[model samples]
Target chain A: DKCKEREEKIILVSSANEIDVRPCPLNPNEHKGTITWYKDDSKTPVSTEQASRIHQHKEKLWFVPAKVEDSGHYYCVVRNSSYCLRIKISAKFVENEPNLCYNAQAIFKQKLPVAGDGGLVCPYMEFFKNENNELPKLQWYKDCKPLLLDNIHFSGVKDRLIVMNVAEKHRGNYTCHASYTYLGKQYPITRVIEFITLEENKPTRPVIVSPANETMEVDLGSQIQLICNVTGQLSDIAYWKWNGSVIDEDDPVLGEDYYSVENPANKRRSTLITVLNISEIESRFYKHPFTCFAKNTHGIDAAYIQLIYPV
Target chain B: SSKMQAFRIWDVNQKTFYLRNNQLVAGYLQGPNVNLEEKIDVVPIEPHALFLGIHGGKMCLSCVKSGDETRLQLEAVNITDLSENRKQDKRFAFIRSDSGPTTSFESAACPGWFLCTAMEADQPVSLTNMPDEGVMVTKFYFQED
Candidate 1:
């Protein structure tokens, strides 16, 4: 409440650590206030007045060689008249340190691939949550042991171990150990290394040129190209499904079907399709038996092509 | 290691946290309005003084003294309408254990600083539809210095 009228006192006087002067029951001539000596509650001062190390006399204060930020909070305030007398002093010093601390940089992932065959795209593991939401336990090790997910190249229903085809023992370091258990004690926090290079599982089982025997037929203005030999990289709304519902893009004849491929080293690129227009086809597509579905995301796991022949 | 005693710490000053311990620490003084967003901790029993525990119900502490002049006190506020947020300046002030000077006043209706030093606008204007009904809600805040 406006600093309760100021008046503090803390004096122990005789302990012998190093003293040269001491005498003040209250008399700097009669105390008018202006006795400041702080070497530890430091707002900075006493970097060196050198006497072997710091000692000021008026109200008496001393410190030299005792380090630890000079060792915390010392006080002396005297502003006589209406009354202002405060004196406080403290000391403690210890030296013998060991430092190395860290924890804040997280990333963790688990076999996220229901059906992906677009060359090789699996190198994203950045995870972090700490404010008590607690989520940091990624310690997957292969050659160094400690990798569990039902072993046998791991895949407890795909927690992950998809290397496809790339080896150096599958390439050493894949460490990601992080820990936290404050109070119950258990701190091992730190480790993140990944080095694997095996990516070749082409995944190509989609080849339906246009509702043939198993399906193929378009009339009303004709047009139904649901092809998909997709291999490796394509991301951005590639979703569609016919007899199974879910097809959107302004509707009235959806379009997106292109393919010109020839890269066995020949390089000619083109693989994208879901074009179905029989004049906005929908009465269940009139002949009912459609399934184009091609996905790259929604968490992944989708690849379809079933037209069921009947021109 | 002499048990270094004289500890009183909760010094978390960097976004409004002051119960006193900043006397002219150079230009632009701002902080002390308990406009909370978490970061106002203090429990320093002595040295400059401190024992603040404001869990933000509205606490503002700001000081500007380059020439000197300070006086602050006026508590109990809940005004709204930062811009159509609705509540256009409501007020409340209480302090009266029986004798004057313990009394703080403010409950504006602004018809000219709200006439009614003690009833008589033809009397009768004390609506209460439930708030425990003992009726007492007067708030006013004005600060700068």
Candidate 2:
């Protein structure tokens, strides 16, 4: 227990991805022994059985695809006949939010050229389907919602989502859902893909074009509309925040509506505008900071503002 | 301009600014939340400054334009009342900002000079242009009363 005070390393991973956690020895040169992985200080060592979803291989604990139930503290002990060294690891598998079809942490990023013939291959699905089994039935959702596919331009064929002519609407988050049958039981398997469509082959990041961190004066009980303007990839998102939390559109206390104006010259870049409506500003609004952010898969940019009483 | 707001200011140490002996001193420990009396009325002086309507006598936070020796001072205005347009009085010119969570202010009358606080408790909030010793903290926090 000499290393009891050692800090535990935290590992955060998406539930859909394969995870491998390695344990390091305190003094590798001085310690020589067999390694044992333990779960939650249990007396027995973690399973080494190949059939187990989570198993120990050498000094590493791996999850072929970590599940929600796989989140917990795990430790490995390195021991010889006389010396024992231990290292602790805290593993957390993040899942999709309750209502969203995509999990941000586990998303696979993909880029496609605008107005080109391209297809998106559903990834991380090989382990769910084997040669002997018929291909698992797959359903694709765009922007987390299902839409009728038109063969004239979009279709799902074999292992890919095919698009004959990519357009602005084709770019966004895509989720592929499939079920694996194990011993007459059904389980869910999903993968999130950030499907981006670019005008040209070159990639670009988003930029915030307004506010510039300026301050505004407003009277109490007066309605104020704060605008966040951004220009970037059509798939980019522009949002507002007050004191670090995203301003929810459904918030009864604050109102919001987002609008976009695509530039006539280029389909690749467009202006996204969001109005953060503080209906009847209250006294507390003076102290809070308001900020706007523009984000794309490439990167993010932000601007901020301060609200106060007019002189 | 007749507009006023109620807010409480604080140092990084979670101590609220208090009016002790008519001087702005930040030493009274407060919860992240507090009562209304601890708050002070601040009126904006347009493009460049803020007036802390202290003691209701046009009592404001100011800085001396004494060159490099500029200091923070609480100036009492007695013009048979605030008959003056306040805009002409550069003395009451502290640039209060709520730019982000860490608020800070600089004096327009004496540029680069900031309204800062002492390192220890029970000390007056001073004014300086980034002290060379640098221990004084100029960044502050604010909460609605």
Candidate 3:
């Protein structure tokens, strides 16, 4: 798609009285570019004396230290004849004194299963961006010592950090340090993140234990036993599924019966599923392999037990 | 003699002071969440200029003459979450002090800037409210002569 080629990736950095303007149609070879800087829709370019600076780069045109006069539609008109284009940037620059500012946010996407689980998110302050600038690098420390995981660290793109498979040792005051350069000006910013390891390794992989050979032909009024087992800590509650629906609590098998068992004493340890009888009413439907599933609320893992019977 | 020059607090919102006690103080009164207080002796820095530390904040200081009252204003928005039958909309301040216990901070009529204040019960102190997450802690060192 031709539209896909024109993705908006632009930045504009300017200072007081200075305006950085680039042509809407950036054709470097021909150098045929036109970005009109106007004052009150007139050809007269705004200056620091009358108006504040307008920072313009690629797709974005923003005003720095803007004034009320800077509030208008900013247009970057460019023409290559073959492709004449105009990109209009409309912004309302309010006339307000630049007050004190102090908001630095950390942003991150958790990269699952790295050295551990919990990762770090570090976002750079907008006050720190500049021309010819690359986002700073971030580092996290465990305890007083540095916690290093997967030499794979993000140096740029919002200054975030992630340490997968976050172990207990990796929990503590995580200090993030960043250094960046803007217009030959280098500065450092620091933020300390704490990663507290709550718990790890959820229930995964199911195992079913039954009698050897597993071939049993019980009478019309007989009972059978089936056991389901799962691995990992079951902190909250465990869910059991037959086909996807909850088995009725007071299910009475006419001929053969079905039942389940779980120990309340040991939490997140194990859950045992039991089927009381073999020759229940719906013999054919229950004849195939039956599975007892165990899942947590987070559903990080779905475990089940499989059992087969032959008449 | 110490360079005890008078300084004014500008942009108390972004400016926080790290005191000699190694505590990060806020520059403005960010309500209870970013609330701050300090009590310090009059460090012999300067008689005309006492020092204070703003907990978990950034303080912008400009050189002013001795005894000149610097306009200390905190620019910040407070956020509070009360669930269920909650009806209290508490106003929090993001405050700061450039001086420590041995140093005294003086301002005319700033509600958040104080030597002592009541501590709210639900105030949470965690990594989320840290002034500078990049540095484990931020300290403000002041000099007056």
Candidate 4:
């Protein structure tokens, strides 16, 4: 007992140091004999079984990602019983939640390819902590309404949202609301998220051809592809319009958009190629005339593609 | 021992019959059996109504629609079925059973999706390999009417 008292050493630590909770000294001189550990005057020795939260690498002992229950007095004995290391671990849980409402807005940018997975992340919740084996309840809302979970929507603990095979309906504003109970009162934290989905563009317009106003006729329900070409000194933005209304590139119900520019050998002029798909020509298209419009710094050009059907 | 003209398909697995609604929907026997005629006309294609038929091949049962001509014999670009036996046209290729009373029709372009009217009433008679509980009934034999 006298020799053990002479060689006894004290080690100290805190619970806030959860990542690397090491109670053993780095002094190589203290590791002379076979080291064994005992917790709080227990007759039984501690090994890897009770030390599930503890780690032992050679002579160093580690409490990897420790918690409040890990706070205790542990004794390390040498083979000769000559050296005794007492680890007085005083781990106390601390609440360091910052101004959760005034944090900078977290921006999540995603380019969701149609028919592919759309990935989104809720920002600025990494510092959030849960207590007493209670996990923070997180719910997602789209455009202020609760997001309905479906076969396509998936979630994880890291505040990540995934939409399988992104579609037109998946586009909107998203927010993650995290709630926890403290002092018998519920506290809720909200994080902002923006969800945008991009789909293949289908343009419905008049393609520039040899004839200024080309009149074509086809039977109802016939699939047609309209080509619009523009020749100019420099290429410009060309698009299709239906009945004076510009068709959106990401419209899911309309035709697809394809554009290409061909440069002449002289390098003085360019040919802009635009393709619009009228997958099926129906009666609705008869009243809504299609137009192909191209504009540049110099001037603007327009062409009309008309469709006719039998009575 | 004789060639049949008009007929209805009885699915052996699902115990139902294949039917179609105006060429748009292909559904199976469902609802009240008393109102079977109201659901769809399980009739045979007339000689004049035949759209695609070979010198000695079975005629297409459905009437010639607007796009029937182009869809009957399509270009390579029209091939959309993800099968090794895919064709450009969505027509049917009849297959006689080796040792059974059933006859199977494979899609010319989409082989996996067959032309079985195993779907419920009001459904389109189209090609689908991934059939549901009722769609699992794919085999059928012609009950000429």
True contacts kept of each: 0.00, 0.00, 0.00, 0.00
Model 4, A139-162: lDDT tens digits are 777766777655446554445676
Tell me the whole-model lDDT of each prediction, alpha carbons only. 0.31, 0.63, 0.33, 0.45
Interface RMSD list for the candidates: 31.8, 21.9, 25.0, 31.4
Candidate 3 or 1, higher TM-score: 3
Assess candidate 3 and give its lDDT. 0.33
Taking the tens digit of each residue's C-alpha lDDT, what string does model 4 give over B32-127?
221332211221121111112321222232211355322222122211121223442234333233114444554433434444553233333444
Q: Which stretches of candidate 3 lie over 4 Å from their true place?
A: A1-119, A137-170, A178-188, A196-203, A211-213, A217-266, A276-311, B1-145
Q: Estimated TM-score per prediction?
A: 0.21, 0.32, 0.30, 0.23
Each model's Cα RMSD: 28.1, 22.8, 25.5, 26.3
lDDT tens readout by residue for model 1, A1-311: 11112321222211112222222223223366666554544344433243444555445554322334544456555555566554444443333223312111211111111222111111111222356554554555643456664534443221124343344444544443445443254443333223433232332322334334254454454456665444322221234566667656676676554433434651212344445444444444554555554322112234554433345
Docking class of 2: incorrect
State in Å the error of residue B141, model 1: 25
TM-score of chain B of 4: 0.40
Chain A TM-scores in order: 0.19, 0.43, 0.36, 0.31
Clashing pairs in 2: none
The 10-residue segment with the lowest total lDDT in model 3 chain B: B117-126
Of the pair 2 and 3, which is ahead by TM-score?
2
Q: Considering every candidate listed, which one attains the maximal TM-score?
A: 2
Error of 1 at B39 (Å): 3.2
TM-score of predicted model 3? 0.30
Model 2, residue A129: C-alpha shift (Å): 2.1
